[PDB]
Amino acid sequence: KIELTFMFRGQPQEQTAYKNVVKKFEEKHPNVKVNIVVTSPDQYATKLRAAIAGRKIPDVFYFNPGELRAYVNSNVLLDITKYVENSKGVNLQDIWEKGVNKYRFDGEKVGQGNLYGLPKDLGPFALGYNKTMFEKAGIPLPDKDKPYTWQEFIDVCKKLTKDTNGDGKLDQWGTGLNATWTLQGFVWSNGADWIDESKTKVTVDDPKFIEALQFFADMQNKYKVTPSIAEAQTLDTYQRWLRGQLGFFPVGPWDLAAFDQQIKFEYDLIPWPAGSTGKPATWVGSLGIGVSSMTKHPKEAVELALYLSADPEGQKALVDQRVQLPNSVKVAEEWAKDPSIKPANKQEFLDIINDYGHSFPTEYTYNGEWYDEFYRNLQPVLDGKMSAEEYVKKAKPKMQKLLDQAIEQEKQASK
Template identity: 75%
Template sequence: MNLKTKKMFTLTMTALMTTSIALAGCSGDGKSADGKVELTFMFRGNPEELKAYKATVKRFEEANKDVKVTMVQTAPDQYDTKLKSAIAGRKVPDVFFYNPAQVKAYVNSGVLLDITKNVEGSKDIQLEDIWKKGVDKYRYDGKVLGKGAIYGLPKDLGPFALGYNKTMFEKAKVSLPDKDKPYTWDEFIQVAKKLTKDTNGDGKMDQYGTGFNVNWALQPFVWSNGADWINEEGTKVTIDDPKFIEALQFFVDQQLKHKVTPSIGESQTLDTYQRWMKGQLAFFPVGPWDMAAFKDQLKFEYDLLPWPAGSTGKAAGWVGSLGIGVGSTTQHKKEATELAMYLSANQEGQQALVDAQVQLPNSMKIAKNWVEDTSIKPANKQEFLDLINDYGRGMPAEKTYTAEWYDEFFKNIQPVLDGKTSVEDYVKKEQPKMQKLLDDAIAQEKQAN
């Protein structure tokens, strides 16, 4: 899930179940009035995802007649707050989505159930067929992530690829990108300039090269330039690295210097996601969760390519994920774990979600067939798998105990994007603030252990 889907969700969602009422709806023994085992499932997503997950849960109920699932759906930008409120109020859902950056804290505080035995002993799923990178995000041995017990399964792996408007390229007679070779930064800017145009002669630009959101699209540029927010050990904030500064400056220059992205004012009138949907941007990030909406709403053909490569000469990108965890306080551990496994790893459940085109399959076998299915657009779906297998990585905060240090970077970055604060001054000011928050996170982890 990303920021651009939040507005879609808000505009299209007509009603939301309130978390407090729904989570308090079970009887004392966790059974409904008709004697069925009652589970609460708390989740979020864009409209297409919500519809698909509701349908998949219904399939689970049909296959498990003695179970009734109360679905608690929450707006994406409110989800973490409501989940934390539920945890603080000791009304942890039986099954719920959660961020992999929360694994350590949720395990240490006793929020998550260890489901290793159920998962490894299940006859309905084949753990070796599930992306190892996905499962490892939810393993924790008390010290190291990626090892030890399983405290959740991936709802999905979400590779954030770069999309391009193929129709726009062809109309402008610009050569299509090479799906196997990334643009250099200079090449990317040159193509973006060719596709930034005033098409009707009124003196105003009608289409732009791109329009990236800094929260979700800066990472590929930083990483491909050999920099990062944090060192390998997870102990030092490294945004003052010259390579990081260079990458952030390149990102800022796309608007301020090269004029290949809409101005702040133009984005307020029509945000970049809407411009992409209207066919007014040449490049825009695409996740598997976008495919259902794009299939029905785009009036142009699009495809995927690698992110532009910085000084390393190699593309970089991120692979997000949400976990499906089981609350440690559930009164029905077996049924709750079976629901989590069905949503994440059961072949029938996976196929239902794939058919809805809201995510990339967790099953590698189904994913292979999915990539080869030419009836499912875009054509180069292999790019999603390349991100998982080759050049994608997790977000920086996944390796630390809390994410506050990372979130701090983006809180006050708007003046940099506006050209009112220099990149150098910004990182110089932010690095010590972020370092203090990271030090606090390290101290919290030591105390918890």
């Protein structure tokens, strides 16, 4: 009788996994049929934005935590608090508090108050290294607790950069980090950030930010511990990591399934190299599972969100399928201690969540346009055509204008 539209995004292993778990949901609730709208991670924001613009909102949908307040003011997200409290068995007090709290809003500040969504996951972005490669090269393994310094990291990367098949051409490299997803840690580790403590002032022209940005680009251009610009163009560094060509690459729990399938070398997790603070940094992502404020079936919609987010059986199926770590803290802890589930240092994911992971800057602002502008024109720095110093001076006023507008519009839209 009842039909739900569930809209989400995922890499192909993620799509497959959630589609399976939705079938499990439907077997459990035979009167609820779930129509799926799924996209690649890159297509999602535009599609969700179109749906919201036309006020044709999916019953259940993935959404960015940074848009919680905007969604609440625009009446996009149903207040699901009472459905979640009335639900049989579930106790989201078991769920990561940092995850649950991202989708609470008391009318004024995020983090407390009524539920406008449930955490899909927490997504600590760990650093992986190719253990097979280290061992074939006789290089001492990275320490599982003590971060490399930046200097040490380049030193090891250089050792790993070599022509291994002896044809005269480099065919193996220290790393090849994607600035979109790996610049944060270097910036943060160096005691910088995109914006100030108040989250209202762009601070990318901070010397510490610049040093981190230049350091990042220099991996490719100056230190040359990555494939060349042309080589990464031919085959991107994620793919080259999969094929065993790179010493170092990040690992999210959502990668685990794809890696199970494609990676044949032994790899493990370590802290990110630490800058001037000496403490490692990286991000802990999250997605919200929200229900349309206008859904015709709030109870069943929340039931699907709950099943994906907090239900032991639903959660178990997702963890089994290697697309996330458990949302239940105690389950995650026993998960991490299980030696038969690789990577050996799974615990690093948890350590990121508890000790040294941060939020994306955009989680603190009303929208993320100011931040998207930073990355929109970053590539010339990344390719050594423009210095980090010259770009951030150019970008800052553009970013700041956009931040100001997001601040103004949060004033307006919440009146």
